[model samples]
Target chain A: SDQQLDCALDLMRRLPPQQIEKNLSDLIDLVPSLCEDLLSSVDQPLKIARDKVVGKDYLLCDYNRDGDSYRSPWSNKYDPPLEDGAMPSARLRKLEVEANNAFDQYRDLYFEGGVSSVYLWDLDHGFAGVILIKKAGDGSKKIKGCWDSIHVVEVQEKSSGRTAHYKLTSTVMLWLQTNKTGSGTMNLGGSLTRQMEKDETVSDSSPHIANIGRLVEDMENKIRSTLNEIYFGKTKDIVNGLRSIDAIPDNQKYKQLQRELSQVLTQRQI
Target chain B: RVSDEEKVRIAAKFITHAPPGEFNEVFNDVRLLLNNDNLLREGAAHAFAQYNMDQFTPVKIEGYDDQVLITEHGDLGNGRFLDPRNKISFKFDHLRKEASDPQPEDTESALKQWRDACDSALRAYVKDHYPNGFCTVYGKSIDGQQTIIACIESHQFQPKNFWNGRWRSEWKFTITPPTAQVAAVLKIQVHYYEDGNVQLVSHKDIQDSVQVSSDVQTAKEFIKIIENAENEYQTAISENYQTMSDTTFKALRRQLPVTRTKIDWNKILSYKIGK
Candidate 1:
């Protein structure tokens, strides 16, 4: 029976010749396990932030609002009334609370999240990067899919765009270039203050922005899925049309666009 | 599958006994022997007199998954092929079909038909579902005609109970000439998706094999004989090439040309790419 288990897993791995098929099957089975893993992982973070409500572990603090200005859950009293008598705007604050709650629920359900940070083998040369994630945002304000938090820089001078630098903890002298956050707000260059105004809940006087790494990963996954759908004419809307969301077409030849998305996974940037 | 040890034994037997040369040479030799060409005897007598005789050294090695492909290397007609276990030299070149060179006009017409077939297959595949399909060209000869292969890549999910239990599939059109000398053999491999779509993978149609002249037909026939001999591997034993003395048996591979030579770009031999 014990051997049977290995045989079973091996069979599962080797049964299909197609990568997409195996990945999809693994993904389907992974949902319940991933949700549970995330739920358990958050226990420590939730406990640490039990009192402050907006501690370092609090990924989304807006929804756990106190009486005023989307304060943390543990904050007993509201901030001193604004000297100008200008209070946190009503609708923005409400949206912030709603978004935060959505984040919490999504996180709890393992609907979306981040991967662990990695210290690449080479470290000393410069700054390295980590993987990040955010749960799916409301389709209404569908911005870029999930985003990566680190800045990646092009090491070759001829190549453009290099920002943050980091050394991998695992290995010395091997470093990867990072991309800097423009104001650390959004990749699209939308200011954080504006983002907070749109949602209006800040953990530190502004909203806790989605993790850049996770956002980028989610976006790439979506784009890759979509391109595959279009290139291979098939039933686009599978699983209650959920998979169809990726099939969204742009005016340009979509395959060219996928090249960039695929590059993130394939291109070795160290 | 033959054990590695068994392969080594089989290889050793060939090393001690079989003649060798390039695949083509052996192919030619086997063909003449089978065809009973008196020309071989005359050539051998002349060579014996001229002292151009070279030793036929057998080179046996392990291939993927314990498969033993042993070659006899020498100057004797690309060395006669010998499957040691069978005690028979095989003809490596067998006719899948026969073909002929057509006039320029007919060649053009055939090429056009193949192109049209490929385009139509691609169009029909794209029209029914999502946009942005791909194109691929592949073909092979059965008896002697060519066939086109279709390949597509996609990321869409193919749920069960949809589209006749077929999510996506690559369709192929194997075109035969109006009147054919022989029935061509078509080889096609289809890779299936976990979600249940059929994707075309690899195909080759070698019509050239049909056009070889009878003068060189001996070479071609020899290749077929050796190929047939290779099938006798069922009863053969093998040696574990891995266990051989590393000091003596260096890893022998076609040497790579310096500076990423164009001869071998991504594993396609430079000569093949016509560099």
Candidate 2:
């Protein structure tokens, strides 16, 4: 009864799906006891042919990925560099086009000044979709913050296709470089990720477009809040704990404002 | 009662901490624990009920502890709470609601003008105060109760600067039947160097009392109190920000890490801003 390990793994399981692999690798690395202990429950085994030859990257294109295989923009081919591989189904092809259009407008509407792309591919059982949203900070504020979001959604469309299960992996990357206001322009940015391990099922009768819109929006809002906390908040803490010279502000200014503002209200509480 | 509040609580908890399962199977089991997870749960349910029914509105904000909202003002359908630590020191005695002057049925129409005036006056005041800002008053009638939320936003990037941000203030209050005792909430939030540079955003909640007089002059009378509260917060918040930046920011920017040498700010990043 390794309750502690169960609790720990369960905690990581609820993190973004992409996070599970790294966390598991770390957890198992710490103790060999868990290496087999955790893997023992996973029924899906990776069976690779030992006699494998040339393989192209399995890229999660829209998310700026170059992985297991390369994506050919022209032929939507999974196996590139070589002569051939599996092609996408017509159903997937059309779905990709619509998703691309929806997110293109989403980019225009939200950022009004950025780039966005959605990439989808056919899977053995269901489908894999990769959504990439990037908004490079523009002029005026002199603060250049690159807000990039990568969401990889895997949908398991069951046999009848009546319902599908959705699992998402997400990363909120903020790369900010500043050089104005006579402040130090360090590489002050961070990347945070949480791929949802909780896969929920929805009736496929509804538009897949609507479904991913909800999913993608949720990822952005959640990560944006994280950006506020992880990055901006971190910046605050540094300056937060640093004040020295105390007295000599207007005492009446403090007391008067406190007195006037003391009447601040909380309309309701939980 | 089958206790659906518990159901909302479960839904709330799962949205944050629940693991994957086949539908609500894992959810139902997890709900059996953390029995006190009602802050978010109550917040969701309160909003849901407010939208889903013609019921009296709940007088509360989400995510606060329970004791703060122990007394419900929803049933009153009319009442106001004011803070007395202000310039105009005192007001009337807190008499019971039943103690009424037994006025006419046209109290609703009379108070309607009062509400509109208050809204317009506040909008104008905000417009003048912010100059380049915009003011919008949002209204909703829950059943018979009329709630108004006005937002005064001053958001713009400097035309010359590379990146910067602005601030927004929201004022929301409810109006019961007649010129009832109305309550209000004011909060001002700001975003600094929004895009990249030392990005920070903060807000504060402040208040002022308005005894609805059910007349056009009522807005003229209470506008000053609202304006007074905003100015006070403007000063207090800036003071807080200055203190936070000076000592805290300076101290952290100067130090070393491993070899422990003073930081050389001159040789940091290759990219430049305001380009």
Candidate 3:
């Protein structure tokens, strides 16, 4: 069941397969009930941030129409009004009142946005890197087929003396493909961003940005659950398709039938 | 058009006369003949090729859910294959013809024969290449996928650096039955290795991607169909290899050779006047 669930989710997102396998395997022992929940969620369509309007790595800030600039508590005078390669115009803004009220801290506000970053384990390395996925068509104008850029980046933000240093040590694009049928694949491009940092201290900004590591585990779980939910519906459709073709039954009997079919098929020679 | 007995005789003669140093070169000619329009000759070529390589050894690995049947073509310790641990493996659904379905002709037997022939040919190709590792696993369920047979071609490049180390790329091609809107198509996968992990980079399913018919009624046709698709995949894989090589070179920041020439003072002075 875990492998089936993992394979389904792997098809939908750019998540790490080996990591998911290990995580689910370990979680099954710690919390068997929770593991079942996780697998079920991964087999269906995602509902989290489904209605959010944003782009890949989109940052929401309060736009001062009067000042004709984007600003937030995260913003500091030392920081440029625009990053070198930022969206020329802000499509939407999180008002100052809502931005603060949304979460007790930026980490809480950040994890459940249009895009969430997940950290997977790499052997001999503590945490390999962040696997970022922006919910499919979340902010896209199209509803049928959408294209999203999967980014693998190492980011670090530190704040001291009223200055925040934010760095993107490495940035690599992992191309993603999605079809109207709710199926797709992600190519990592064999590109790994070496350790690079974008150290910036937004003058007068608090150390809120420094707490990125604090909620990282929480973010990982959020990503896992969110993806589990997204692929849940598709997995059901696949099972239904198999049942409709009379290849397998509609119930758990399908598992047995599948095993038998695969065994027979593979064992049969020309 | 040669007779089966004559084809075998020809192959035996070729191998018998092959010089110790030039044995491989002569064997390659037999492979070339197999690749051309010769059926019985192809069989003889496969027999002699296997004779040169060692006996067939099927490496079996049983997992909790799947079984791997590995047929090693040759020993990689001799440095025939590029890498000592690189592999290209794939899984696909079996043919769909059932005994219950009545046919005007004996299509079921013909299809089975064709599949067997294809399997043999596939092994011959693998033996000729002397891959480091390869296997065809069955009963692996790929959700939302319907591929009858899939082939994977893997290439390994020498490691460059920590950031761009141990490059191994694979191209996977799957032959599937026709769907409602599209004909039987080949599903292709372009993937590479990172940190000893396989990462999918791209996939395509189009008619032009393969040249095969959905109605494969004979073994002879099936062999040709698969061979054609393999050739297509090889071409695409080679292109991807070049792209990967260039990408890795850029990532490594390695210095590439460049040409330079001294500029003439007269050329510079005449530049404005000539214009």
- Highest DockQ, which number? 3
- In candidate 2 the C-alpha lDDT for residue A148 amounts to 59
After superposition, the stretches of candidate 1 with alpha carbons farther than 4 Å from their true spots are A1-4, A7-270, B1-113, B120-124, B127-135, B156-168, B176-275
**Candidate 2 structure quality by residue, lDDT tens digits, A84-194:** 544456787777766765666555544554555567777788788777666655444444556556677888877764566788877655554444322222234435566
Report per-candidate DockQ: 0.01, 0.02, 0.04
Best model number under TM-score: 2
Candidate 2 clashes: the total is: 31
What are the per-residue Cα lDDT tens digits for candidate 1 across B80-190? 333222223332221211112211212223433444444444434333232432223333343555544333322222223322111122333344333222121111122
Q: Judged by DockQ cut-offs, is candidate 2 incorrect, acceptable, medium or high?
A: incorrect
Rank the models by TM-score, top first.
Answer: 2, 3, 1
For B1-275, candidate 3 gives per-residue lDDT tens digits of: 43445544554454433321223434454444323335434455444434332211122222322122322222223212111111222221111111121112222232333244444444444434323323231111135542223232322222242111111112222344432212223222222222222233333443334444534332234444444544454345333434333442122111211112221222222234333
Interface RMSD of each: 28.7, 18.8, 23.8
In CAPRI terms, where does candidate 3 land? incorrect
- Candidate 3: segments with Cα more than 4 A from true spot: A1-164, A167-175, A178-195, A198-270, B1-198, B201-221, B232-275
List candidate 2 stretches off by more than 4 Å: A1-87, A139-141, A197-205, A242-270, B1-275
Tens digits of per-residue lDDT for model 2, B57-150: 1122222111011112211223321111110111111211122222122223423454566666875675456533444444445576666544
TM-score of 2: 0.34
